[PDB]
Amino acid sequence: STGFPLELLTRPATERLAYFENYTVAHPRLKEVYEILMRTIAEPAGASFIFVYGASGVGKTTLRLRVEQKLTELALPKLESDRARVPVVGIEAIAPESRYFNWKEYYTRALITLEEPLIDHKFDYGAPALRRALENALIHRHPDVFFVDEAQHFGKVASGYKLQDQLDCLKSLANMTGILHCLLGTYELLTFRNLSGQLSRRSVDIHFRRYCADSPEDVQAFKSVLLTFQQHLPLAETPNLVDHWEYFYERTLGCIGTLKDWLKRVLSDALDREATTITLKDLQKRALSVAQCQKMFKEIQEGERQLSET
Amino acid sequence: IAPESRYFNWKEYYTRALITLEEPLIDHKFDYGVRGISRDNFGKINVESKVVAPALRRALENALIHRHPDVFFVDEAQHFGKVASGYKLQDQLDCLKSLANMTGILHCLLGTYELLTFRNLSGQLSRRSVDIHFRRYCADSPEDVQAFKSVLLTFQQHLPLAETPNLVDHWEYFYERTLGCIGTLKDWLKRVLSDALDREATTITLKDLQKRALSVAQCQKMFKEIQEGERQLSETEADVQNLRSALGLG
Amino acid sequence: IYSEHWSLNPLEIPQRSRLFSLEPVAVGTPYAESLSSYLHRLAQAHCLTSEKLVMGEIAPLILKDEDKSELLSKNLSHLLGNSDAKPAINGMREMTEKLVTVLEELTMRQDLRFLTLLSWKGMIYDKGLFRNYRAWCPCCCEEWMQKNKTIYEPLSWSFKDVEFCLIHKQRLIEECSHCGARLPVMARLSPAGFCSRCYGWLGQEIKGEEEIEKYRVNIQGISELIALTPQLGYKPIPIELTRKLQLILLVFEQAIGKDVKLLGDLGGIMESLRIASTTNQSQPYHLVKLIIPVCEKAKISVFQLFGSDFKELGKILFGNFSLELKL
DNA sequence: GCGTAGATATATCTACGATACGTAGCGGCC
DNA sequence: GGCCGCTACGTATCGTAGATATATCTACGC
Ligand SMILES: Nc1ncnc2c1ncn2[C@@H]1O[C@H](COP(=O)(O)OP(=O)(O)OP(=O)(O)O)[C@@H](O)[C@H]1O
Numbered sequence: 001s002t003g004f005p006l007e008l009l010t011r012p013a014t015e016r017l018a019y020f021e022n023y024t025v026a027h028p029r030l031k032e033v034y035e036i037l038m039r040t041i042a043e044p045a046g047a048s049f050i051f052v053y054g055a056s057g058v059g060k061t062t063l064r065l066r067v068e069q070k071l072t073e074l075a076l077p078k079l080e081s082d083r084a085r086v087p088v089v090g091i092e093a094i095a096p097e098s099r100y101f102n103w104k105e106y107y108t109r110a111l112i113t114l115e116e117p118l119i120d121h122k123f124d125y126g127a128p129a130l131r132r133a134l135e136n137a138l139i140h141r142h143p144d145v146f147f148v149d150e151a152q153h154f155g156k157v158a159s160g161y162k163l164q165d166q167l168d169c170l171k172s173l174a175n176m177t178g179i180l181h182c183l184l185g186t187y188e189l190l191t192f193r194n195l196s197g198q199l200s201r202r203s204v205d206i207h208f209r210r211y212c213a214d215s216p217e218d219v220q221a222f223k224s225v226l227l228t229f230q231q232h233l234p235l236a237e238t239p240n241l242v243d244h245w246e247y248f249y250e251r252t253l254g255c256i257g258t259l260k261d262w263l264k265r266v267l268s269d270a271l272d273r274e275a276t277t278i279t280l281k282d283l284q285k286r287a288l289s290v291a292q293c294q295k296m297f298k299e300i301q302e303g304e305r306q307l308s309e310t
Numbered sequence: 311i312a313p314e315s316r317y318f319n320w321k322e323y324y325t326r327a328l329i330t331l332e333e334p335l336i337d338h339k340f341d342y343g344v345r346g347i348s349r350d351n352f353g354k355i356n357v358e359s360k361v362v363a364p365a366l367r368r369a370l371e372n373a374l375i376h377r378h379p380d381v382f383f384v385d386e387a388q389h390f391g392k393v394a395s396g397y398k399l400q401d402q403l404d405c406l407k408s409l410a411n412m413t414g415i416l417h418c419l420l421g422t423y424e425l426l427t428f429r430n431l432s433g434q435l436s437r438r439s440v441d442i443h444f445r446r447y448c449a450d451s452p453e454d455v456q457a458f459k460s461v462l463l464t465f466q467q468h469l470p471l472a473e474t475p476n477l478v479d480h481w482e483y484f485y486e487r488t489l490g491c492i493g494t495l496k497d498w499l500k501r502v503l504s505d506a507l508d509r510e511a512t513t514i515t516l517k518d519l520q521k522r523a524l525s526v527a528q529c530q531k532m533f534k535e536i537q538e539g540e541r542q543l544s545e546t547e548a549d550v551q552n553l554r555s556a557l558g559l560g
Numbered sequence: 561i562y563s564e565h566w567s568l569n570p571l572e573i574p575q576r577s578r579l580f581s582l583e584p585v586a587v588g589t590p591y592a593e594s595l596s597s598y599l600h601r602l603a604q605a606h607c608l609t610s611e612k613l614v615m616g617e618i619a620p621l622i623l624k625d626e627d628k629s630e631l632l633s634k635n636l637s638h639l640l641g642n643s644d645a646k647p648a649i650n651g652m653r654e655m656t657e658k659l660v661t662v663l664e665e666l667t668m669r670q671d672l673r674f675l676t677l678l679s680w681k682g683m684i685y686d687k688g689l690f691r692n693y694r695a696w697c698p699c700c701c702e703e704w705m706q707k708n709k710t711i712y713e714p715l716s717w718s719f720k721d722v723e724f725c726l727i728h729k730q731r732l733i734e735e736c737s738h739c740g741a742r743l744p745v746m747a748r749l750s751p752a753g754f755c756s757r758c759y760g761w762l763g764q765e766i767k768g769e770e771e772i773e774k775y776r777v778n779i780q781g782i783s784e785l786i787a788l789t790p791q792l793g794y795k796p797i798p799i800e801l802t803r804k805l806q807l808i809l810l811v812f813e814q815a816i817g818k819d820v821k822l823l824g825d826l827g828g829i830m831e832s833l834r835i836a837s838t839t840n841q842s843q844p845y846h847l848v849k850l851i852i853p854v855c856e857k858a859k860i861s862v863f864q865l866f867g868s869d870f871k872e873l874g875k876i877l878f879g880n881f882s883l884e885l886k887l
Numbered sequence: 888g889c890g891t892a893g894a895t896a897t898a899t900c901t902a903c904g905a906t907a908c909g910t911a912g913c914g915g916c917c
Numbered sequence: 918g919g920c921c922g923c924t925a926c927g928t929a930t931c932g933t934a935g936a937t938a939t940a941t942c943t944a945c946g947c
C-alpha cells in the first residue's frame with residue numbers, strides 16, 4: 001500500500017521513527033543495479049572483481065546489505081545439511097592511522113568476521129601467517145562472495161605503483177581461494193578499476209548512477225520517489241513534498257540516501273515538537289550547507305567525467 | 311592532544327580515549343579484545359607499550375560498540391591538523407570517519423576557526439558531516455549589539471559588589487577587548503572582580519578594566535583570524551545560484 | 561509510485577562450526593587417516609600448532625574446571641597424558657574417547673569415530689596392539705607429496721603387527737633418518753610426514769626386501785578391520801561377535817568330527833576359542849593373537865567375519881569345510 | 888626400573904622503533 | 918635557459934626489550 005499503517009499515529013514517537021528508518025524504497029536504479037549484481041554473483045563468468053562505484057549516498061551500503069540478506073536466505077535451505085559454509089562475507093575497509101594502508105589489520109579483521117579461533121596466537125607453517133590463515137579459511141568455509149566496503153581506503157599509499165599493488169595483494173589472496181571479491185566504494189575507486197590486464201579482464205564494473213536532473217525520465221523518477229516518501233512519512237497529516245522538488249534536488253544532488261536522511265531529520269524534528277505537518281522552514285532547518293553540496297557535486301562530476309570513458 | 315613531534319600520535323589518542331571512556335564502577339567485566347589491555351587492582355586499566363596501535367584501536371571499537379555512547383566529544387579538534395604530508399589531512403579525517411563508522415557513534419568535534427581546514431575536504435566527509443557555527447557578537451547588526459548590551463547588564467547585576475557598576479556606557483570598550491566573546495568577557499570580569507575584592511572597593515573603576523584587559527596586539531590577532539574564517543563560513547544567495555546552475559536545476 | 565518495500569532483517573542461519581569441517585581421508589578403506597594425523601591437519605589448516613589449537617579449543621571442553629586462558633600456556637601432556645601418549649591414542653582409550661567426542665561436537669561431523677577403534681571397545685584388547693613410537697612409510701609420503709596429494713598417517717602404521725606397506729612392499733621406518741631419534745605421535749608441532757623433532761623429511765625411496773608373506777595375513781586382516789567399521793552402519797554388539805566366534809567353533813568341531821587329522825592343525829585354536837567362549841563375553845578378545853588366526857584357519861577374511869550376517873557366515877563356513885549343515 | 892613429564896634459566900632470534908646518511912627535487916645564480 | 922647547492926625525506930641499519938627453543942635436573946606414573 002502507498003500509505004503507512006494507520007495505527008502508528010497512536011503509537012509513541014519512537015515507534016514511528018523506527019517504522020520510518022527500517023523502511024526503504026526501491027527506485028529503478030537501485031533495483032537495476034541489484035539485478036545486475038546478483039546476476040554477476042550467480043555467474044561470475046571468470047571475473048574475480050565486481051567493482052561498484054557510486055556517489056556518496058546513492059545506496060551502496062543498503063544494496064550491499066540487501067544482497068547479503070537475499071543470498072543468505074537463498075542459501076539457507078541447505079546450510080542445515082552442510083556446516084562451515086558461510087554464505088556471504090561482507091566487511092568494511094579501515095582507513096589507516098599511519099600513512100600507508102595496513103594489511104595485517106585487514107587480514108585479522110577478515111579472520112574475526114569468519115569467527116576464526118585463536119587469531120592472535122596463530123603460526124606460520126613454513127604478515128604471511130595471517131594471509132595463509134585467511135586463504136585457508138576462505139578455501140574451507142567456502143563463501144559465495146566477499147564484499148569489501150569503502151574500497152577507496154585501499155589506496156591510502158603514497159606510492160602510485162603500490163596503489164595497484166594493494167589490488168595485487170587482494171588478487172593473490174583471491175586466486176588461491178577462488179572467491180569472488182566485489183569491492184564497493186566512492187568515486188575514488190576508478191583509480192583502481194582496470195589498471196593492468198589482470199584487473200582489466202577479470203573485473204566487471206557496475207556504476208551506481210545517481211538521478212541527474214537533465215533527463216525528464218530521471219526527473220519524473222525523482223518526483224515519484226518524493227511522492228512515495230511523502231505518502232510513507234508517518235505523520236498525522238501528509239505534507240505536500242512534490243511541489244518543492246527543485247529545493248529537494250538542490251540539497252540532495254539526486255542521491256536517494258541523502259533525501260532519506262534529510263527526511264528522517266525533518267520527521268524527527270516534527271515528532272519531537274508533536275507537529276502534524278512538515279513546513280518549508282522545517283526542511284530549511286536541517287538542510288545541508290551550500291558549500292557541502294558544492295563540494296559533493298564537484299566530486300561526483302569529476303567521477304562521472306572519469307567514468308564517461310566509452 | 312597537541313603532539314611534541316610533527317605527527318599526531320594516534321596511539322596516545324586511542325589509549326586516552328580508552329582510559330577516559332572506561333571509568334565506571336568495577337562491576338562491568340567486558341573482557342576487551344587484544345591481550346595487552348586489562349584492568350588492575352585499583353580499577354584503572356593499563357596498556358603496555360608493546361601493544362600496537364591498531365589493536366588498541368580495535369579494542370576501542372569493541373568498547374564503543376558495547377557501551378554505545380550517544381556522542382563522542384573531542385575538544386580543540388584542530389590538533390588533528392599537525393602533520394607533515396599535505397594530503398595527510400584527508401587521511402586523518404578518513405581515519406576518524408572510519409572509526410566512527412563501524413562503531414556507529416556520532417563524533418562531535420569542537421575547535422577554533424583553524425578547524426576549518428577539514429570543513430569539506432572531501433565529498434564523503436562533506437555529506438556525512440553537519441556544521442554548527444558558534445558565531446560571536448558582531449557590530450554592524452544592531453540585534454547582536456543589543457544582545458551584548460543585555461549580557462553586560464546581566465553581568466553587572468550579578469556582580470557581587472556593594473555598588474552595581476555601570477557597564478552599559480563603555481560597551482564599545484568591552485566589545486573592543488572581549489570582541490563580543492562571552493567567555494573572554496567573563497574572564498575579564500573575573501579578573502576585575504578579584505582585584506576589586508583584593509582592594510575591597512565597592513565598585514569597578516574604569517582603569518581597573520584596563521589593568522586586566524588584553525593587549526591591542528592580542529586583540530588584533532584575535533580579529534585577524536576571526537574575520538578570515540568568517541568569510542570562509544559565509545553562505546550567500548550568490549553561492550546558491552551557481553550550485554543550481556551547475557546542477558542544471560536553474 | 562513504487563509499492564516495493566524491502567526488508568533488511570537478518571536471517572539467523574544455523575550456528576557454524578567452531579573448527580573447519582575437514583573431511584577425513586579414505587574413510588572406509590585400508591588407508592584411513594588416523595585421529596592424530598587429522599588433528600595435525602586441522603591445526604595446519606588453521607595456521608596453528610597442534611598443541612596451541614589443542615589448549616585453545618579442545619582443552620576447555622575436555623578439561624572441565626580450569627581457566628581457559630591459563631590453560632593456553634601449558635604443555636600438551638597436561639590434558640593428553642604423554643606419560644602414556646604413544647600411537648595408542650588411536651586406540652580405544654578413555655582420553656581417545658573424550659577427544660573424539662569433543663572433536664565431533666566442535667565440527668559437528670559424524671565420522672571421526674571411524675578414525676579410531678572406540679567402536680571396538682570391549683571387543684579387542686588394548687595391550688600388545690599399538691606401537692609405542694611413531695612409524696611411517698617413506699615411499700607413501702614421497703608418492704603422496706609428488707602427486708600433490710594430502711599427507712597423512714594411516715591407522716595401519718600405528719599397529720605393531722603392521723610393519724609393511726602392501727602398496728610399496730616397504731618395511732615401516734620408526735627412526736628419523738636425519739636426527740636419528742624416534743618421534744612421539746603427539747608433539748607441539750608434528751605435521752604429517754615431517755620429523756617432529758628436527759623438521760627433516762621422512763619420505764624416501766626405501767626398498768623392502770624381507771619375507772612379507774609372514775605378516776601378510778596380519779596386515780590384511782587389520783586393514784580389513786579398519787576399512788569395515790565405517791561400512792557397518794551401527795555400533796557393533798559384543799555378543800554378536802562372541803556368537804560368531806562360537807559358530808566358527810562349532811564349525812571347527814563338526815569338521816574335526818568329519819576329519820580327525822584337522823585336530824592336529826586346529827587344536828590350539830580350538831582351545832583358545834573355547835577359553836574365549838568360557839570367559840566373560842564382555843571381555844575383549846586379542847585381535848592378532850586370537851581372531852586373525854581363527855578366521856585364517858577358517859579360511860575366512862576379517863571382512864567376511866565382521867560384515868556378513870549369521871546365515872551367510874554359516875553357509876560360507878559349511879562350504880569351506882564341506883559340511884552338510886544348513887542354518 | 889625407566890621413561891617421561893614439569894619447571895626454570897638463559898642466550899638468541901625477532902619485531903619494532905630510533906637514527907644518520909644518501910639522494911633527488913627544487914630554488915637560486917650566471 | 919642551464920647547472921649547482923641545499924635540504925627534506927625515505928630507508929637501511931642497528932640497538933634493545935620481549936618471546937621463545939631448549940637443555941638439564943628431578944619427580945612420578947607406567
Ligand atoms: N533507496 C533508499 N531508500 C531508503 N533509504 C535509503 C536508500 N538508499 C540509502 N538509504 C539510506 O542511506 C543510509 C545508508 O547509507 P547510503 O548507502 O545511502 O550511503 P553511501 O554513501 O552510498 O555509503 P557508504 O558511505 O557506506 O559508502 C541509510 O540511512 C539508509 O536508510
Ligand SMILES: [Mg+2]
Binds near residue numbers: 059060061
Ligand atoms: Mg553508506
